[PDB]
Amino acid sequence: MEVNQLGLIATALFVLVPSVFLIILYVQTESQQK
């Protein structure tokens, strides 16, 4: 339709970036010995 061109990328990075953040931590936590 007649939507915003950047809407897609704004929504994509809005989800990816912080999700990628959490995930990087959780996995580095999860793999800490003992």
Ligand X SMILES: CCCCCCCCCCCCCCCCCC(=O)OC[C@H](CO[C@@H]1O[C@H](CO)[C@H](O)[C@H](O)[C@H]1O)OC(=O)CCCCCCCCCCCCCCCCC
Q: Is 22 in the site for other proteins (CB under 8 A)?
A: yes
**Cα gap 30→21, rounded to integer Å:** 14
**Cα gap 1→31, rounded to integer Å:** 46
Query: Using CB under 6 A as the criterion, what x/- string covers residues 13-32 for binding ligand X?
Result: xx--xxxxxxxx--xx-xxx
- For a copy of itself, the closer of residues 2 and 33 by Cβ is 33
**Within 13 A of 12's CA, how many CA atoms are on the CB side?**
5
Least distance from C-beta 15 to ligand X, angstroms?
Answer: 9
Residues of this chain that bind ligand X (CB under 6 A)? 4, 6, 10, 13-14, 17-24, 27-28, 30-33
